[PDB]
């Protein structure tokens, strides 16, 4: 079943929220995956990579598995789950849950010209994990996703159709490489345009609007 | 050695005391009977262990509050103390007796005040 635990879960499931846009605005911390499932049942999973971990441990080796799963729509929503567990299947299951928590929206935009319908990125944006620099780079439309297999997949969830990408740093470190691509897309809401410079009134927190119902 | 209380004993000992307290006593023998009423423990030695530990705790309670044991009677005592509230034991006597800095502020706030 559903069943919402927590005030945060009560707000969303009981139809007091209609959109995930609201959740992002008031910076509500998702930690139960069920919350995002009710508003968005259209989320698609995709197990990206399984990679072995090994320990030598106090009484026998105890070998774990990293599991990378990206859950998202194909419309501005990427979500990143990484779990380490002794069983492959358990790590995958947990990663699906984690990915749903960590869903964060991605600005699609235009370059120079306001074109028709956002399909690119508004600005040049970079994401760093370890030493690897990954760059969102302006591209004319119809270029396709100019990337290796795995960075294409991440940008499909983002809904971005056209960018050049380039990376430098250790590309050979599979674990880190997947992590680095995510950060760029979330950091889109970190770059100044005059378009988003425009001042908004401030919407009111659900914590004060729905005191009685909680 | 040997005779240390376990976790299972620690949880049970507090609980029995808390909601049986008037009936409970310092006396070992009667509190053995109480554990028959309150629980089924399968072997003989378990009953004796719990009964002994609880009575030792009962002595401590009636000589000072115990860290993880709160009773109806002890809670009432705490409440009575924390119903009193004047200013919260500041008085000083009428008008305060400041020592510059605030003297300059109080003068240009229309408050006379004593100094010292």
């Amino acid at each position: 079943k559903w069943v919402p635990v927590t005030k945060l879960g009560r707000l969303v499931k009981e139809g007091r929220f209609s959109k995930i846009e609201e959740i992002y605005l008031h910076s509500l911390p998702v930690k139960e995956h069920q919350i995002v499932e009710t508003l968005v049942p259209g989320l698609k999973d995709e197990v990206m990579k399984i990679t072995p971990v090994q320990k030598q441990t106090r009484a026998g080796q105890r070998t774990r598995f990293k599991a990378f799963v990206v859950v998202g729509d194909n419309n501005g929503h990427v979500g990143l789950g990484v779990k380490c567990a002794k069983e492959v299947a358990t790590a995958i299951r947990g990663a699906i849950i984690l990915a749903k928590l960590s869903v964060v929206p991605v600005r699609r935009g235009y370059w120079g010209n306001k074109i028709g319908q956002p399909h690119t990125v508004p600005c040049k944006v970079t994401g760093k994990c370890g030493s690897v620099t990954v760059r969102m780079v302006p591209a004319p439309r119809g270029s396709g996703i100019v990337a290796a297999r795995v960075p294409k997949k991440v940008l499909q969830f983002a809904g971005i159709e056209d960018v050049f990408t380039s990376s430098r740093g250790s590309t050979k470190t599979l674990g880190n490489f997947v992590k680095a691509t995510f950060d760029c897309l979330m950091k889109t809401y970190g770059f100044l345009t005059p378009d988003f410079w425009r001042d908004t009134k401030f919407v009111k927190s659900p914590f004060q609007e729905y005191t009685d119902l909680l | 050695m040997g005779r240390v209380r376990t976790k299972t004993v620690k949880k049970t000992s507090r609980q029995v005391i808390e909601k049986y307290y008037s009936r409970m006593t310092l006396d070992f023998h009667t509190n053995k009977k109480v554990l028959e009423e309150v629980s089924i423990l399968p072997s003989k030695r378990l009953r004796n262990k719990v009964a002994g530990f609880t009575t030792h705790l009962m002595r401590r309670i009636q000589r000072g509050p115990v860290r993880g044991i709160s009773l109806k009677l002890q809670e009432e005592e705490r409440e009575r103390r924390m119903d009193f509230v004047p200013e919260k034991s500041a008085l000083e006597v009428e008008e305060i007796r400041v020592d510059k800095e605030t003297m300059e502020m109080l003068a240009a706030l229309g408050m006379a005040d004593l100094p010292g």
């Binding site: 370059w111 770059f191 100044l192 378009d195 001042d199 | -």
Partner: protein, 130 residues
């Protein structure tokens, strides 16, 4: 050196601080950057203090931020004078992607990227406004 870069660098680190200015000494190619900021409204006011008797010239800035969003997201230098790296009206390398402008000292004087481009006159980039 030539100041210029120092102003730009100081500006962005001071934005992270959330200060209402930093105030510093200024020169004549760093008179230019401030007036260009006013036009594209990163500043809605600037004041050039003590430029009259003193050893130097200076200007305390009153600067946009302490609002909601920062207006100047990044300004970072792209080479001072004493160098040959050069652009023309057709050569145009850029930052941003048209949200910002590329600061250019042209033949007539300092003007923004679009003004210089229309007139069809090249020049040398001073910095990159994003």
């Amino acid at each position: 050196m030539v100041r210029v870069s120092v102003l730009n660098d100081a500006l962005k680190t001071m934005y992270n601080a959330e200060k209402r200015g930093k105030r510093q000494v200024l020169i004549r190619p760093s008179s230019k950057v401030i007036i260009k900021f006013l036009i594209v409204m990163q500043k809605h006011g600037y004041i050039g203090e003590f430029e009259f008797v003193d050893d130097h010239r200076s200007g305390k800035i009153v600067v946009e931020l302490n609002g909601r969003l920062n207006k100047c997201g990044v300004i970072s230098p792209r080479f001072d004078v004493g160098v040959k790296e050069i652009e023309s009206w057709t050569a145009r390398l850029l930052p941003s992607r048209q949200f910002g402008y590329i600061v250019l000292t042209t033949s007539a004087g300092i003007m923004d990227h679009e003004e210089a481009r229309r007139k069809n006159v090249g020049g040398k980039v001073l910095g990159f406004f994003y």
